Write an enzyme that holds these catalytic residues in place. Structure first.
Site, short mmCIF file in Angstrom:
data_model
loop_
_atom_site.label_atom_id
_atom_site.label_comp_id
_atom_site.label_asym_id
_atom_site.label_seq_id
_atom_site.Cartn_x
_atom_site.Cartn_y
_atom_site.Cartn_z
N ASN A 136 33.33 15.71 47.46
CA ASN A 136 34.28 16.26 48.42
C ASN A 136 33.62 16.72 49.72
O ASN A 136 34.28 17.32 50.56
CB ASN A 136 35.06 17.39 47.78
CG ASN A 136 35.96 16.93 46.67
OD1 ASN A 136 36.41 17.72 45.83
ND2 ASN A 136 36.29 15.65 46.67
N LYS B 219 41.99 10.77 42.13
CA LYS B 219 42.60 11.14 40.86
C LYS B 219 44.04 10.61 40.81
O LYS B 219 44.48 10.18 39.74
CB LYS B 219 42.57 12.67 40.64
CG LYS B 219 41.37 13.43 41.25
CD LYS B 219 40.01 13.02 40.68
CE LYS B 219 38.86 13.62 41.46
NZ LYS B 219 37.68 12.72 41.52
N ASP C 40 37.38 23.54 45.27
CA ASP C 40 36.90 22.26 44.76
C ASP C 40 35.70 21.77 45.55
O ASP C 40 35.58 20.58 45.86
CB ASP C 40 38.04 21.23 44.66
CG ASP C 40 37.80 20.14 43.62
OD1 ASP C 40 37.09 20.41 42.62
OD2 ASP C 40 38.34 19.02 43.79
N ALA D 28 35.11 9.64 57.71
CA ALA D 28 33.73 10.17 57.69
C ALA D 28 32.82 8.94 57.47
O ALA D 28 32.77 8.42 56.35
CB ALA D 28 33.59 11.16 56.56
#
Ligand SMILES: Cc1c(C(=O)NS(=O)(=O)C2CC2)cc(-c2ccc(Cl)c(Oc3ccccn3)c2)c2cc[nH]c12
Ligand SMILES: Nc1ncnc2c1ncn2[C@@H]1O[C@H](COP(=O)(O)OP(=O)(O)O)[C@@H](O)[C@H]1O
Ligand SMILES: O=C(O)[C@@H]1CCCC[C@H]1C(=O)O
Ligand SMILES: [Mg+2]
Ligand SMILES: [Mg+2]
Length: 260
Positions: free
Chosen positions: A136, A18, A131, A88
């Site tokens: 995420n 964002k 969130d 990740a």
């Protein structure tokens, strides 16, 4: 250790944010592969979310759990802020869902267990993630789930206002006071999305999604099993007090039967 951008070799973008982008990076001395979440100061200032960026850093840097993404440190220069994150390698649960369409009951129950464990640890520190959504949720080298993006993370209780409303509970949507129970609602939304392929309050407009959440207006497709319906229905309670503890989620018969 007061890092600087000169300490890292930058690779391909890993994902768009964002307030900037996340890049793959390698620390020059150790050859340590990591992810650099780059944020633009001008954008953060204009949004007035600086204070919230410091909370993301302070909260995530103190968490240590195998199902929570690590934040090794951060630094900044004249125009940007850089968060040094654990890489990740198997990407987002969002991308896995896009290619598989839906997860089976075993994959779903396993992800729900990994989430419930990570959230139990968070809540024990009175940390609310707020969130929890597939973009995420990242995947480690063994395909284990890792909660990431503590961007909207706060300490409970909170009466602080913050994409779609799809994962947000009624109390957050209405700008009311909230606690750790917000993450229990998000867990119910995720369980449904993993099994069905879309969140239960999904709609064309923010206005329609708001109404669906407020009403707790959702239906299950026929293929959703009794055990799965039971857990989801228990989590998606308009009243945060009526939502079960994470201990109850982990001990739920459908979770114990299909995990892991
Ligand atoms: C305009 C500006 C600055 C800024 O230029 N400061 S400074 O160069 O004067 C410095 C002596 C204080 C700093 C920051 C900022 C905010 C949050 C974090 Cl987490 C941040 O990273 C770090 C990095 C290391 C230590 C502390 N925080 C930086 C933001 C955000 C939007 N515009 C900003
Ligand atoms: N450590 C990471 N390893 C791999 N991909 C990542 C990592 N962190 C972020 N990404 C990718 O970048 C995207 C944006 O990162 P995120 O921290 O969620 O930023 P934002 O707060 O802007 O949503 C993620 O949804 C994911 O696709
Ligand atoms: O890390 C970020 O991009 C942001 C920091 C400021 C609060 C909002 C947050 C986000 O969107 O996750
Ligand atoms: Mg994100
Ligand atoms: Mg974020």
């Amino acid at each position: 250790r007061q890092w600087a951008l000169e300490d890292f070799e930058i690779g391909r973008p890993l994902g768009k944010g964002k307030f900037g982008n996340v890049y793959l990076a390698r620390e020059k001395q150790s050859k340590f592969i990591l992810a650099l979440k780059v944020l633009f100061k001008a954008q953060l200032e204009k949004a007035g979310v600086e204070h919230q960026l410091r909370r993301e850093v302070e909260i995530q840097s103190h968490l240590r759990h195998p199902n929570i993404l690590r934040l090794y440190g951060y630094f900044h220069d004249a125009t940007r802020v850089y968060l040094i994150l654990e890489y990740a390698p198997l990407g987002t649960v969002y991308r896995e869902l896009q290619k598989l369409s839906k997860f089976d009951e075993q994959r779903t129950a396993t992800y729900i267990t990994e989430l419930a464990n990570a959230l139990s640890y968070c809540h024990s520190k009175r940390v609310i993630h707020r969130d929890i959504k597939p973009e995420n949720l990242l995947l480690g080298s063994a395909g284990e789930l890792k909660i990431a993006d503590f961007g909207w993370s706060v300490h409970a209780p909170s009466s602080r206002r913050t994409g779609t409303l799809d994962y947000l509970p009624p109390e957050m949507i209405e700008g009311r006071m909230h606690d750790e129970k917000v993450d229990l609602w998000s867990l119910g939304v995720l369980c449904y999305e993993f099994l069905v392929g879309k969140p239960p309050f999904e709609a064309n407009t923010y206005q329609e999604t708001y109404k669906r959440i407020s009403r707790v207006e959702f239906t299950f497709p026929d293929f959703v099993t009794e055990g799965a319906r039971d857990l989801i229905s228990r989590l998606l309670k308009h009243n945060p007090s009526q939502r079960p503890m994470l201990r109850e989620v982990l001990e739920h018969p459908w979770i114990t039967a299909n995990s892991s």
